[PDB]
């Protein structure tokens, strides 16, 4: 992705957009009960912690575009992936405005808590004043579509989350490029059924895992993989995508019966952005921070892995490539060993910066004992080996519990963490609960004991 130009929004006909400059994050009742070294990301140029230009740091994610056209390998990748999806027999019909708005089987209703984007954010109109989840009224939406149309500018927000000390000083704050409610709605109408087919089919046929439930899905993954696992992490995935990867995506969409509206992808590829009093144009790069794009990134990931395997290992049998992606995150496999570093090398030529799985310094063999997916390890249950535990290390859980965004949500936030932590074992979980119960706020929470979560789990299958 590359920023073509940037200038004052007034100069091109747009208003100034106000974005909160103060973090909602602050020490929780457990700040000193658990170890942690992360703080709230920088949200403004003046932040005292900053050790470099903020504006320059947040936009530096656009490394540029390494490729213009789709080569032979990418085309081969497209034909293979498109072919796989074809077996899902996905419904190509456009989805009605009602379901696109209030959801249907396999698609959740629009999230009322996220920005409505332009121009509503500049009119002080929230999603609430537009949809009645109990009425399922489309009149208002329809009138707005007719009024403001589509292909609107994306509104940029600095993400309010925890980051390491280094990233705070280097102004490496992640960004959210929220698309207008109009486009988000138009796209769900165009691809709603594609979205549904994916949510209902997490696995190696869609090569996707969006919409999956880790507690249950972790027991299906091992059976879907080949003998040899391989994996790696991406540095700035979304931002690094070149226009060609969007064209490859459209080719897949055309082949599976959505050629009807591949133009919506152009909107993601050549995008229009608003930030503060500025407006800028980007070529390439997948608009970040939101769920609407998870599926397209996953599809593209499937195209990438396939392409690098064809360019590096001529004669490879893609029919035996078994992979599952969640945006840029991926766990893959093949009957034969492959070299991630070699693949990493082939990747540089495609605009992707690939590095060792899980922040390793060197590319080591990926095994069932060291692989992670969605920050979670895999661990067979001691009593019932066929049941697989998704295990998230306590470290990130400790980091998270030390802060709070709304005292009113302490109960939900801590319960959330409990659902993640108990998979670490009864000993660890109990220590966790005891430390929570060492301060007043914790003793007042309603939290599930271990045997209760274990029983619930065995009963969810």
**Rounded Cα gap, residues 309 and 306, in angstroms:** 5
Q: How far is the CB of 3 from Na ion (least distance, A)?
A: 10
Cβ distance 49 to 184 under 8 Å?
A: no
Q: Which of 120, 121, 126, 123 lies closest to 145 in space, CA to CA?
A: 120
Q: 40 or 285, CB closer to Na ion?
A: 285
Residue number with the smallest Cβ distance to Na ion? 271
Q: How far is the CB of 249 from Na ion (least distance, A)?
A: 12
**Rounded Cα gap, residues 114 and 42, in angstroms:** 20
Cβ distance 281 to 3 under 8 Å?
A: yes
Binding residues: 233, 328
Indicate the helix (H) or strand (E) that contains 324: strand 322-326
Tokens coding 381: 């249950």
Q: 171 or 285, CB closer to Na ion?
A: 285
Q: How far is the CB of 264 from Na ion (least distance, A)?
A: 13
Buried b (16+ CB within 10 A) or exposed e, 52-67: eebeebbbebbbebbb
Tell me whether strands 377-380 and 162-163 are parallel, antiparallel or unpaired: unpaired
Q: How far is the CB of 115 from Na ion (least distance, A)?
A: 18
- Interacting residues toward Na ion by CB under 5 A: 271, 282, 285
Q: Which residues, including other chains, have CB under 8 Å from residue 344's CB and lie 6 or more apart? A: 232, 354, 355, 363
Q: 119 or 285, CB closer to Na ion?
A: 285
Q: SS3 for 373?
A: strand
Q: How far is the CB of 33 from Na ion (least distance, A)?
A: 43
Q: 4 or 367, CB closer to Na ion?
A: 4
Binding residues for Mg(2+): 233, 328
Q: 115 or 293, CB closer to Na ion?
A: 293
Q: How far is the CB of 286 from Na ion (least distance, A)?
A: 7
Q: 9 or 84, CB closer to Na ion?
A: 9
Q: How far is the CB of 448 from Na ion (least distance, A)?
A: 43
Buried b (16+ CB within 10 A) or exposed e, 15-30: eebebeeebebeebbb
**Rounded Cα gap, residues 186 and 266, in angstroms:** 14
Cα 35 versus chain centre, distance: 27
Q: 102 or 234, CB closer to Na ion?
A: 234
């Amino acid at each position: 992705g590359e920023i073509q130009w940037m200038r004052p929004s007034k100069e091109v006909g747009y208003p100034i957009i106000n974005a909160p400059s103060k973090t909602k994050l602050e020490p929780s009742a457990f700040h000193y009960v658990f170890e942690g070294v992360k703080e709230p990301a920088v949200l403004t140029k003046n932040d005292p912690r900053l050790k470099t230009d903020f504006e320059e740091a947040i936009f530096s994610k656009y490394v540029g575009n390494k490729i213009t056209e789709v080569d032979e390998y990418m085309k081969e990748a497209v034909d293979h992936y498109a072919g796989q999806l074809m077996s899902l027999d996905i419904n190509t019909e456009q989805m009605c405005l009602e379901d696109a708005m209030y959801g249907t089987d396999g698609l959740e209703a629009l999230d009322l808590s996220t920005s409505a984007g332009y121009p509503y954010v500049a009119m002080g109109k929230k999603k609430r004043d537009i949809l009645n989840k109990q009425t399922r009224d489309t009149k208002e939406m329809q009138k707005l579509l007719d009024t403001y149309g589509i292909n609107l500018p994306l509104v940029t927000y600095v993400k309010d989350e925890l980051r390491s000390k280094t990233k705070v000083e280097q102004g490496k704050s992640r960004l959210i490029e929220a698309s207008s409610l109009n486009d988000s709605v138009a796209m769900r109408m165009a691809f709603g059924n594609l979205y549904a087919a994916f949510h209902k089919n997490p696995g190696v046929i869609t090569g996707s895992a969006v919409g999956c439930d880790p507690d249950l899905f972790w027991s299906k993954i091992p059976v879907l993989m080949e003998e040899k696992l391989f994996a790696f992490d991406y540095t700035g995935y979304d931002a690094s995508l070149s226009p060609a990867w969007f064209e490859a995506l459209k080719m897949v969409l055309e082949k599976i019966g959505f050629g009807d509206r591949v133009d919506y992808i152009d909107y993601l590829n050549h995008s229009h952005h608003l930030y503060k009093n500025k407006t800028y144009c980007v070529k390439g790069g997948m608009p970040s921070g939101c769920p609407g794009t998870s599926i397209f990134n996953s599809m593209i990931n499937n195209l990438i892995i396939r392409t690098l395997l064809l360019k590096t290992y001529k004669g490879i049998d893609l029919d035996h490539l078994k992979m599952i992606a969640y945006g840029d995150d991926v766990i893959a496999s093949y009957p034969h060993e492959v070299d991630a570093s070699l693949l990493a090398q082939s990747g540089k030529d495609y605009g992707l910066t690939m590095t060792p799985a899980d922040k390793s310094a060197t590319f080591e063999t990926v095994t069932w004992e060291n692989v992670t997916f969605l920050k979670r390890f895999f661990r067979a249950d001691e009593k019932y080996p066929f049941l697989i535990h998704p295990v998230m290390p306590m470290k990130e859980i400790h980091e998270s519990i030390r802060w709070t965004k709304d005292p009113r949500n302490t109960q939900d936030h801590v319960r959330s963490l409990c659902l993640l932590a108990w998979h670490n074992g009864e000993e660890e979980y109990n220590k966790f609960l005891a430390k929570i119960r060492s301060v007043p706020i914790g003793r007042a929470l309603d939290l599930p004991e271990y045997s209760t979560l274990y029983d619930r789990w065995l009963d969810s299958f």
